[PDB]
Amino acid sequence: TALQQAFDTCQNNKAAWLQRKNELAAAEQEYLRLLSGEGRNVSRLDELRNIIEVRKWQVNQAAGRYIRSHEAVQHISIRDRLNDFMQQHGTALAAALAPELMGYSELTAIARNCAIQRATDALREALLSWLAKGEKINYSAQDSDILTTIGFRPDVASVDDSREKFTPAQNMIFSRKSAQLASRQSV
Amino acid sequence: MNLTELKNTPVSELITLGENMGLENLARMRKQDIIFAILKQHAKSGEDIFGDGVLEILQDGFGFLRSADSSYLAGPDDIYVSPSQIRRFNLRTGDTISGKIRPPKEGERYFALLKVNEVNFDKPENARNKILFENLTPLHANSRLRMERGNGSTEDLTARVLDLASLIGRGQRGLIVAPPKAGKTMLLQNIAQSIAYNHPDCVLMVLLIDERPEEVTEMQRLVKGEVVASTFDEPASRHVQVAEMVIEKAKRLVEHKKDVIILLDSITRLARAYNTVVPASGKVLTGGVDANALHRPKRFFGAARNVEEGGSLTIIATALIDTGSKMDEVIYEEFKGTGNMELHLSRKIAEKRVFPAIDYNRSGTRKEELLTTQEELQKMWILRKIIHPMGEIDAMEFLINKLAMTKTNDDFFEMMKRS
Amino acid sequence: MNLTELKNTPVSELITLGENMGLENLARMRKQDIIFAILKQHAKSGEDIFGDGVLEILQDGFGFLRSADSSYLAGPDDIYVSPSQIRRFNLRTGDTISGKIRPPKEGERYFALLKVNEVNFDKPENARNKILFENLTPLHANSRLRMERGNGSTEDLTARVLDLASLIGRGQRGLIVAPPKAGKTMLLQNIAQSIAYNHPDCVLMVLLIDERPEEVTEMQRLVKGEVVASTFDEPASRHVQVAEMVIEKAKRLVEHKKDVIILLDSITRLARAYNTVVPASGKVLTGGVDANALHRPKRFFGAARNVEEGGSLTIIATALIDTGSKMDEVIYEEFKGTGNMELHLSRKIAEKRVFPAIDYNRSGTRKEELLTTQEELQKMWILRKIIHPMGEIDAMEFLINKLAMTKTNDDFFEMMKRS
């Protein structure tokens, strides 16, 4: 049930990020409307600038969280799909990679590391050789639906909003300002 | 009902409850008077009411009972304590009394005490058998008080730097010397967070002297342990009263083999209050401060000790320097060699936004070999040796960028010995 | 029973005595008041009780008798001494008195004195015919006071370095100049251990001024000779009172052809207390010191002498430098040329953790010919010649390893002369 919980947590993160984008756009458009208005409202403009900055930070945080959740879902899908494939064809893997794979239970640590690195880059070379012809591949039959729903990659709007980086001091001051804003809006 | 739950109740809920009881207008007066009126109404109801708080002895046994939430303010709702129970219970200042309380009758205006069912969170005869604080022999601090939270917080750099900077143990006497605008308040906040996080058993007390109201109201909503604060509005008499109450309560708590921690912001403010409250001794030192005036604060700062039989009292009091007044320098120099732990903060590092701003080479602790193990001690010694030549700003930026790239101080030790 | 034996008992016996004598409510107050109440109750039964202590006289003959266990603290257990007794016996401060005591009657609350049994560990009329200390002709130090225990311990190495740095004689006015965090406390520990081991006959006194309680209590449980100290919580009046009490007791002891040794930590803080206790003379020197402020510390330091009639009085007082306060510096140059032997500690050697950190090149003793035999005098001279050109850190590491390979000082001399 780990795949299912990862999937709906990713969906919840998507919904939260979309929502935060909605409030960010609404605040930006309302601030622009007041700026176009005749009324000065200097304090209103300043607090609207604060609003849009805090909501931009919130959108960036939500996008980052959703990106990490999607990456975790993809990683666990890779883990279990590889697990079942290797449980199917482990004897074939052993037959193909015997000359440097047995003795792992008794080889030294440096020998174990060198052997696994040789197996790793041999597998990398084989994967490149197979991808050379460029045959198209579909998703795994068992878990195709979840991976298709979450998509191959996160949306471009998720990635373009994560370019900016915030220092820990910036992170803590933004968190405090967001908490104060939520408390004020609730009242 | 309980008095504390009424005191912690918000004002709007208090006036709503008063309206339910029947009072037409109990909103346009102080909260203490509102609570006093609620007590009047519920005593007229006739039901039994609980009571509790910290006891205080006056000059003639005219005992009072305050609460820590109201910063020990002399309010009308403070519980009267007759000398009779003072005599047959052997109670002094700082005792935590709880039990039945008598509604006052004509001729008096303070709630009397019916009977006690707990003192110092213990049975009264056990409190009688307890030993008085100053008879307990002190030692050096033995139990390490780790500041690193270990949760991998993005702000946790302050606690890690503190752990690598000055060893804090269960019984230290600490000073935080810092110029204005250096981060004393948030350093104390991080220390309080670490105490409430890693060591939930020890009692944590934060005392603020004549601080700004905004910092105060930020303080009660940030720390977990109970916090007492005084603003600059009220005179030095209330500051002295609050400090004496806090130190007596800490002594009473530590008499029960409990661990008490007191954070003082700041010792200079309390020293000035003591200087301006006490009568002149006839001779004044430089800076316009009486020589005897500093006798009282020392007894506070000197209360920190590690008792053999049980419990400990740790005091971390910050001191202000470069403020611009000579008496502040006099107070600092009188306290220069008093505490066994000292942490120096630099204005130059603070103004360059490399936080926490700590002067490493000028900050240290006494008897550090007793607090921690050996291998950690040589690791820290190697760290001090390597970062000693470099300047304070360079040293702090190097520590920051080395500590930020991993999560645990052990990993930092591993990488510094490996590299 | 004996007042001294019950005073030396810990607080654990307090509850046992209280429950034996029927006073249960006897634990939660001052220990001195407890001793006073217990002695009152025991004297009410009509038994015989002894007493002893150190006598002191006020300005109007209101004589009191304190005990060294409570660090000469003015408490209810102090013994009355009427003007009639001090006129018939002509006793002053510092006299050790032992004999009968009397329970106080109505009108007073101080235990009185019936008759004396022993005065200064002597029959009173024999101590009656004694010549005054100020009438004793001083001389130079003659009897060498070796600091080498000879048991081949680990810390003994420090003491061994001492015997190679500055010879200490009997009746020698010594000075220890050290920065903060330099190891002066452990140096005093080693000196006290050497006195208690090599020369058990001479009276050893360890005096501490305004020291933190942990070091005060650690001092009491390590030295064999009696130790007196006042914490920095106490006012300057306490510090001075302790100073005159100790110096008068030492003078009284040395008047009976006894060898008294005093270890003072620190003369700088004692001078500070004297400065802040004496009235202003209208003439202030640089650093906030008064002209007569340092007068009394000078007498205290110069009381050390070698008396040809009999006895000796050695004083080893440490002075603080590089503290950061100009007044400590001023006190330092006011004592620079006073002592006849001095020993400098250096911060930089302590930074490299090489211990003991002694500035060998600048340390020494004047007129050391009378304190030692000639052959080892030339041995030390050639050692100084070969150690002088190289730096102090290199000098100390060289000395430490060379002494570590050897077992006694003579072994060190022979192994350095064979090469």
Ligand SMILES: Nc1ncnc2c1ncn2[C@@H]1O[C@H](COP(=O)(O)OP(=O)(O)OP(O)(O)=S)[C@@H](O)[C@H]1O
């Ligand atoms: N670790 C930190 N992260 C973010 N900001 C910090 C940090 N340390 C200090 N600062 C900033 O530096 C200043 C320190 O503020 P305070 O802690 O209130 O100063 P202070 O030491 O209390 O001295 P006072 O009371 O203002 S005179 C504030 O502007 C903080 O935002």
Ligand SMILES: Nc1ncnc2c1ncn2[C@@H]1O[C@H](COP(=O)(O)OP(=O)(O)OP(O)(O)=S)[C@@H](O)[C@H]1O
């Ligand atoms: N021979 C020694 N062997 C091992 N450690 C030593 C030795 N001498 C000193 N130290 C250490 O050096 C430090 C000096 O401690 P103290 O003697 O208490 O300092 P101090 O000279 O009393 O100055 P204060 O009291 O701190 S202002 C302690 O950490 C000791 O453990």
Ligand SMILES: [Mg+2]
């Ligand atoms: Mg502040």
Ligand SMILES: [Mg+2]
């Ligand atoms: Mg010391």
